[PDB]
Amino acid sequence: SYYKSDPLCSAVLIHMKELTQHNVTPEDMSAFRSYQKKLELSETFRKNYSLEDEMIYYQDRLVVPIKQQNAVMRLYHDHTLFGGHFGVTVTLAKISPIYYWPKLQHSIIQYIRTCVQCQLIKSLQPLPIAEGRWLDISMDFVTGLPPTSNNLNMILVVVDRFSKRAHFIATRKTLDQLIDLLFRYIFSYHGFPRTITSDRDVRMTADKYQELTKRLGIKSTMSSANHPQTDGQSERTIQTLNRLLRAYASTNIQNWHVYLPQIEFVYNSTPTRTLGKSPFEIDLGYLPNTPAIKSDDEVNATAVELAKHLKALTIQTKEQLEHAQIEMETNNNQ
Amino acid sequence: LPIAEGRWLDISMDFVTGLPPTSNNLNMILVVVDRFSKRAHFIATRKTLDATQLIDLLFRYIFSYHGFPRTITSDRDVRMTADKYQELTKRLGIKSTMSSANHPQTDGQSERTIQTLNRLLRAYASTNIQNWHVYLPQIEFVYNSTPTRTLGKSPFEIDLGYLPNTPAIKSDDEVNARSFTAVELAKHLKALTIQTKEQLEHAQIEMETNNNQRRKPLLLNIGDHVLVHRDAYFYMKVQQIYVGPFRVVKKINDNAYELDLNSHKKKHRVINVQFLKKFVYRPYPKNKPISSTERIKRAHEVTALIGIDTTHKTYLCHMQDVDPTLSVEYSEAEFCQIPERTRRSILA
Amino acid sequence: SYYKSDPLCSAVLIHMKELTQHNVTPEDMSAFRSYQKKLELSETFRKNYSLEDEMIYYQDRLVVPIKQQNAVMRLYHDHTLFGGHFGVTVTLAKISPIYYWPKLQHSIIQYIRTCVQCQLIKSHRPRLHGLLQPLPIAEGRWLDISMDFVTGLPPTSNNLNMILVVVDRFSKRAHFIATRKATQLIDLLFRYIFSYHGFPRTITSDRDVRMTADKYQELTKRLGIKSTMSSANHPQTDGQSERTIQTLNRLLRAYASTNIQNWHVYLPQIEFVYNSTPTRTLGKSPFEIDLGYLPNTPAIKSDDEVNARSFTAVELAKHLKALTIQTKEQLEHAQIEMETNNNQRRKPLLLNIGDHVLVHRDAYFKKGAYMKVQQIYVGPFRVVKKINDNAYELDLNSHKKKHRVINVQFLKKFVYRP
DNA sequence: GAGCCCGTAATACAACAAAATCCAACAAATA
DNA sequence: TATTTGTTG
DNA sequence: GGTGTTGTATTACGGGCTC
DNA sequence: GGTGTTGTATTACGGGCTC
């Protein structure tokens, strides 16, 4: 009594389903596109339809005839079966995993264009929110680092307060001036913020940053000089130097500038005291670690294979120790 | 190649050169393309910084700091065919999947990004020699924010959700201004994953439509002979640039045959079908010399040459009216007697 | 610092927006298009304009007044708000989700033809810019001759280095000119190998220094020989000789696979084999296109006859006339077939006077100049003469550039805008 | 319509598009 | 251990 | 005046059979 | 396991008018 319990031998999918049948071709007027599609199916490699007792379907989706396209869109768009007139994203997330529907997204957006009930005043030009994501960053300065035999005696800390993500990277303390915003701009994988709230010391910069913003489209001003909040974030900024000191304690030749990205990877690959999840999968899917294979040094087909994964495991133990020390510091202090 | 995974578990990268120096940086194109979302990062570098030993991995990890991949697709470049690179990736659980001896179409989406990158590089390259290394992050930020064609959404918003700053939110919804509470990101980011996945089956279908119209597949079983026609010997104008037949060993794909072009020498003995060609030996042909005295008298009946074995003293060549691929070993005891003046002429 | 914070009561959309307001109609000069658009709106039913607190827009997209059209398309095309100088499709994908703009596609392609950097940087298949328009077919036999050569081969014993070819446009008769990669004695060897038959009328060749050759050109002007002299890095005009060296390369590989460094012995065999084998665009052997005296005669051809032109002594005039007529119509058939199978996408370009065309860094700079990711910012040149249907001479703003003939495959005509 | 044999015979599709040096850098081969 | 020499973006 | 052009597998169209 | 892929002018197909 439900759908698909009806014969429809005159539609677009007939040419696709006659690849094995080859019985009857009852096409309509201007249906030479269907014959071209069957020729396409012949000369390409997409044949995965299963032919069992009138159930013609794709690898996991049941195809639908083009005649009841209006019926399907009304069933899955309106309030006939407890709908609600959602957006194209939710509608396609509901429809596509179940049915194949060649040209489905265009069908959905065409139905949105040809519908009239949902098109009301929606409001306005841009979103307004004081809390966001990558829209407000802060940074600070550190001093005591080894020269690393390349005069790289600095670490550039970047904070992502809206999502607690971090970016620690080696620089030179002599000149962190145009080279600072160059490496900041290659850091900017996630767009400009609204305001920068560094609040470390006097800053003669933000003039050439202002000229960059004039040369660009964003109004990212750098401000908040000599402020004083001191509520939780100060603890994080103070404890930031601790992990870098632990990375310093490893070595000095081929030091933390080697595998410091891995230090950041398994530094933010941990939940923040179980209250907040890891910054990788709070935004992305998971950003997988995949450390499963580490002991295969029998043949390998102290600086190439072995010590690299020993250093990775050492960094993992170091970040575990840092997590333990910060959670016990919070337990003792609070 | 396989469609997509969970946000660039499949990835591609490649190199192009010819870029003008600014700080002795004449490579500067290490483009890494986040195949699912097509985020397509590229970072400035040089030839002389590394050869996959010291610093190449370090900016590879600062790229990979934003998520480890699970599959690489790259070329047969010396910077990635090294033993150090393959073993470290294997211990990282990430495949190599190299190319097929000058077949860059395996790295097609990275090279297509380069093709888009080159136009924008010429657009931003007015100060060609003086000071322009600031333009590559600018080109990255411009190219990621620009909507593509095969998906309809900009590669920046496909992975990250939202668009960059200065919101120019379209007439769909407020959903592209998704910078708020993160506990519900998984559902709609997976919905966008479904959208983009559908756009990539559409892209794969569109690619296979207009390209397979003239192309004809080649089907070979293991054992039958095959010619390589190129990439066997690197003044190749009048001389026999095309070389003799070899026996296929492993059929990796329908368009991927592993074959014994030489004895055991070097360099990844698998050739794409574009260079490969069928061989037919339907045919007074002579017999197969197997005795010790038949390799000396029957040495003036040679036809062509392959070369000299690198492992020991054994020359491989082709005789006349015999089994072509099944060569007969001819050492120095039966090499100097026959006139070899016309033998090295085709090798040189 | 956002836009649309301005009322404009004087534009095209005023007639459209007074369909609800009906208050003020302060039209401007050349605003009669608004009257016609309002008339078309009145006789139809497509009213979807929304009037909300000075934001007049389409069903979901903001219609923009024509005063700030260029500002909006420059904003979404240049890097002021991160455009990037892309094509019409990406520009639509940036603008059409937010703005409506009646005839937006035409306006955007007009802007693409308007923006200068897009004209200088983009290519958009700059190999299909003129029709085929092939050479005039022929005259009597051995009057048009095609000249070119491949520069280098694996050298022989140190007396011969490279192969030069002479094939006539009519009969396509192979030749074996084996040179040394030459001197001003080119006219000696060339004279000895064409003057075997006789002096031609025109030479279809490239601008090569052995033929640009002011000493050699004056010889042709005195003797009565023209010179087509195909432009810089445009070897298509040479044609028959290029196609012959294509066939010669396969033949030379066949006859010198195991016999490198002494291919000068086999070169007469190469040309004799090319001469004895019938072609496709004429259907006959080049001996038969000439005086038909295939000397080998392994077997008599189809439609068996006397087939012995040695026996004929005085009656050769009618035979050569018949061969000339059928080969001329076969050449015309080859011409029209080439034109049909090539011009399916070749868009013509006919200017002939008074334009500001470009040359996109090919035949402008050296062929030996390296092509790289260096910017392509050739200046706007000028055209003063229509030298041919498929090329235009330019006033190259250099010392001389040694040539000023540019085939249409490098032009990409520049268009300004006030 | 419906297909098949067979015998010619057209038919877009790509090759001639200067030639040959290395650059940087993996790993084999002696001595 | 330095100087070679196969192949490949 | 001066500006493509054929070799090649591949494939499409008539006499003669079954209708 | 491992093997193309999008940017771009250009052009083709539905609502609304004349029939």
Which nucleotides of strand E lie within 7 A of protein CB? Answer: 6-9
Stated resolution in angstroms: 4.0
| B136 touches C64 (CB < 8 A) | no
Q: What is the C-alpha separation between A247 and A255, in angstroms, rounded?
A: 8
Burial class (CB in 10 A: 0-12, 13-18, 19+), A227: exposed
The answer to whether the CB atoms of C253 and B238 lie below 8 A apart is yes
The answer to whether the CB atoms of A119 and C2 lie below 8 A apart is no
Residue of C nearest to A126 (CA): C2
Per the DSSP assignment, residues forming a β-bridge with B305 are B317
Residue of B nearest to C267 (CA): B238
User: Which protein residue's Cα is closest to nucleotide G2 at C1'?
Assistant: B97
Q: What is the C-alpha separation between A109 and A88, in angstroms, rounded?
A: 7
Of B7, B43, B83, the CB nearest to A284: B7
User: Which amino acid appears at position C181 of this protein?
Assistant: K
Residue of B nearest to C248 (CA): B238
Crossing angle between the packed helical segments C240-255 and C267-276, to the nearest 10 degrees: 120
User: Which amino acid appears at position B58 of this protein?
Assistant: L
CA A259 to mean position of chain CA atoms: 23
Best mutation target among B39, B43, B92, B216 (most A Cβ atoms within 10 Å) is B92
The answer to whether the CB atoms of A216 and C59 lie below 8 A apart is no
The neighbour count for residue C79, using CB atoms within 10 Å, is: 17
Distance (Å) from the C-alpha of residue A138 to the closest C-alpha of chain C? 24
Distance (Å) from the C-alpha of residue C105 to the closest C-alpha of chain A? 19
C98 touches chain B (CB under 8 A): yes
Q: Which long-range contacts (CB under 8 A, 24 or more apart) does C291-295 make?
A: C291/C316, C291/C320, C292/C319, C292/C323
Burial class (CB in 10 A: 0-12, 13-18, 19+), A6: exposed
* Nucleotide with the nearest C1' to B72 CA: G2
Quote the DSSP letter at residue B129.
S
Q: Which of left, alpha, beta for C203 (phi over 0: left; psi -120 to 50: alpha)?
A: beta
Query: Sign of the C-alpha dihedral, residues A107, A113, A115, A120?
Result: positive
The answer to whether the CB atoms of B122 and C121 lie below 8 A apart is yes
| B27 touches B46 (CB < 8 A) | yes
| C79 touches B126 (CB < 8 A) | no
The answer to whether the CB atoms of C79 and A219 lie below 8 A apart is no
Approach to solving = cryo-EM
Q: Count of CB contacts below 8 A, A vs C?
A: 10
Question: Does the annotation list A296 as a binding residue?
Answer: no
For Cα atoms A64, A70, A74, give the angle at the middle one, nearest 5 degrees: 105
Distance (Å) from the C-alpha of residue B346 to the closest C-alpha of chain C? 6
The answer to whether the CB atoms of A127 and B41 lie below 8 A apart is no
C117 touches chain B (CB under 8 A): yes
* Nucleotide with the nearest C1' to C233 CA: D17
Which nucleotides of strand F lie within 7 A of protein CB? Answer: 1-8, 10
Q: Quick check: C292 CB within 7 A of strand D?
A: no
The answer to whether the CB atoms of C81 and A219 lie below 8 A apart is no
* Nucleotide with the nearest C1' to B46 CA: D24
Could you give the count of Cα atoms lying within 13 Å of A284 in the half-sphere of its Cβ?
A: 24
| B66 touches A189 (CB < 8 A) | yes
Q: What is the C-alpha separation between B326 and C413, in angstroms, rounded?
A: 60
Of C52, C59, C82, the CB nearest to A217: C82
User: Which amino acid appears at position C245 of this protein?
Assistant: I
Of A119, A216, A219, the CB nearest to C59: A119
Q: Tell me the backbone φ, ψ of residue A276, rounded to 5 degrees.
A: -125, 145
| C235 touches C242 (CB < 8 A) | yes
Closest alpha carbon to A312 in A259, A249, A270 = A259
Quote the DSSP letter at residue C391.
E
Radius of gyration for chain C, computed over Cα atoms and rounded to the nearest angstrom: 31
User: Which amino acid appears at position C321 of this protein?
Assistant: K
Which nucleotides of strand G lie within 7 A of protein CB? Answer: 1-11, 14, 16-18
The answer to whether the CB atoms of B168 and A194 lie below 8 A apart is no
CA A300 vs CA A10, A86, A111, B91, B157: distances in Å: 62, 55, 59, 10, 41
Distance (Å) from the C-alpha of residue A72 to the closest C-alpha of chain B? 19
